[PDB]
Design an enzyme around this catalytic site. Structure first.
Site, PDB file in Angstrom:
ATOM      1  N   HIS A  13       0.912  -1.054  -0.031  1.00 57.75           N
ATOM      2  CA  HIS A  13      -0.056  -0.061  -0.192  1.00 57.75           C
ATOM      3  C   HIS A  13       0.876   1.306  -0.002  1.00 57.75           C
ATOM      4  CE1 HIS A  13      -0.195   0.910   4.615  1.00 57.75           C
ATOM      5  NE2 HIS A  13       0.113   1.868   4.192  1.00 57.75           N
ATOM      6  N   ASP A  42      -0.734  -7.163   2.229  1.00 59.96           N
ATOM      7  CA  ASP A  42      -0.196  -6.058   2.133  1.00 59.96           C
ATOM      8  C   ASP A  42       1.654  -6.203   2.658  1.00 59.96           C
ATOM      9  OD1 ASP A  42       0.206  -3.236   2.137  1.00 59.96           O
ATOM     10  OD2 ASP A  42      -0.597  -2.857   4.162  1.00 59.96           O
ATOM     11  N   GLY A  95       1.842   7.146   8.763  1.00 61.54           N
ATOM     12  CA  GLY A  95       3.312   7.528   8.622  1.00 61.54           C
ATOM     13  C   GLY A  95       4.196   6.117   9.170  1.00 61.54           C
ATOM     14  N   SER A 138       3.199   3.149   8.347  1.00 58.23           N
ATOM     15  CA  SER A 138       3.175   1.979   7.380  1.00 58.23           C
ATOM     16  C   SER A 138       4.429   1.293   7.048  1.00 58.23           C
ATOM     17  CB  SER A 138       2.336   2.308   6.407  1.00 58.23           C
ATOM     18  OG  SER A 138       1.123   2.233   6.626  1.00 58.23           O
TER      19      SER A 138
HETATM   20  N1  LIG Z   1      -2.285   1.222  14.562  1.00 60.14           N
HETATM   21  C1  LIG Z   1      -3.157   2.110  13.826  1.00 60.14           C
HETATM   22  N2  LIG Z   1      -4.132   2.337  14.790  1.00 60.14           N
HETATM   23  C2  LIG Z   1      -2.934   2.404  12.720  1.00 60.14           C
HETATM   24  C3  LIG Z   1      -3.488   3.455  11.840  1.00 60.14           C
HETATM   25  C4  LIG Z   1      -3.076   3.642  10.651  1.00 60.14           C
HETATM   26  C5  LIG Z   1      -3.303   4.600   9.727  1.00 60.14           C
HETATM   27  C6  LIG Z   1      -2.651   4.482   8.460  1.00 60.14           C
HETATM   28  C7  LIG Z   1      -1.796   3.267   8.265  1.00 60.14           C
HETATM   29  N3  LIG Z   1      -1.504   2.701   9.126  1.00 60.14           N
HETATM   30  C8  LIG Z   1      -1.949   2.591  10.322  1.00 60.14           C
HETATM   31  S1  LIG Z   1      -1.489   1.678  11.482  1.00 60.14           S
END
Ligand SMILES: NC(=[NH2+])c1cc2cccnc2s1
Lengths: 9, 248
Positions: free
Chosen positions: B46, B97, B196, B198
């Protein structure tokens, strides 16, 4: 020196 | 990362920072990643899906700060960018992913071992820690979901793995979480991964080693009660990783 996975120094 | 502490790369020497170049002069941070072997970094599909033009990404190893240099850092180009065939996104989850980036330095080399650059270990076929295990996540993602900038200093925090039964509960994510994902949260929903972060690692100890057990993939909000972070379950992709990675 060489990589050792998972080792922090 | 929400909560957590500020660290330096010596503490996460396998963390890779991926940036994209823009025609105009600026480079922006894209996602995090982890070094598997000297020439390969693993992240999330992604992160590249929208702009799969490898020539425009730059990967740095040995980096403790986001836009300022760290001594000892290494810069690489992406020789190969492998996205997962079967990658899907729905109104929340991302499926399959995982992505691999083969790196090449401007001198034709891959990563070299240092006190700030080290590889992380992969699990064995479908082997994972048990729920309850505390693992650490690291990255330059947001510190609050309302922020619109990323921290300049690397962060890390610790979360615990939760079971699929707990995560697939209707008031959590229902069946949006599959067997190829893992969920991890803070008991008191105080720290978590966020936008951020990811592509970065969920590292746990398995059979004595620090293993890459998950890759930050998605989540609803950040540090939201009954909204765990969902990670790609690396132990279930081993055949895929193998069919693409080779040598040193
Ligand atoms: N761990 C979470 N609550 C996340 C939220 C996001 C939001 C965008 C991308 N990745 C993640 S992990």
């Amino acid at each position: 020196l060489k990589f050792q996975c998972g080792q922090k120094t | 990362i929400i909560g957590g502490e500020f660290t330096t790369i010596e503490n996460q020497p396998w963390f890779a920072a991926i940036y994209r170049r823009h025609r105009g002069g600026s480079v922006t941070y894209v996602c995090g990643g982890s070094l598997m072997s000297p020439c390969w970094v693993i992240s999330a599909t992604h992160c590249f899906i929208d702009y799969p033009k490898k020539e425009d990404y730059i990967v740095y190893l040995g980096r403790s700060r986001l836009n300022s240099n760290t001594q000892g850092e290494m810069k690489f180009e992406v020789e190969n960018l492998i996205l997962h065939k079967d990658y899907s996104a729905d109104t929340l989850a991302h499926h399959n992913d995982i992505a691999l980036l083969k790196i090449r330095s401007k001198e034709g080399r891959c990563a070299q071992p240092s006190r700030t650059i080290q590889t992380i270990c992969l699990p064995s076929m479908y082997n994972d820690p048990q729920f309850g295990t505390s693992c650490e996540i690291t990255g330059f993602g947001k510190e609050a979901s309302t922020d619109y900038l990323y921290p300049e200093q690397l962060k890390m925090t610790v979360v615990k793995l939760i079971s699929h039964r707990e995560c697939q509960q209707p008031h959590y994510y229902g069946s949006e979480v599959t067997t190829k994902m893992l969920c991890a949260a803070d008991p008191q929903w105080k720290t978590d991964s966020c936008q951020g972060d990811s592509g970065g690692p969920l590292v746990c100890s398995l059979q004595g080693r620090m293993t890459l057990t998950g890759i930050v993939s998605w989540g609803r909000g950040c540090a939201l009660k009954d909204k765990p972070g969902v990670y790609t379950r690396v132990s279930h992709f081993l055949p895929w990783i193998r069919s693409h990675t080779k040598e040193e």
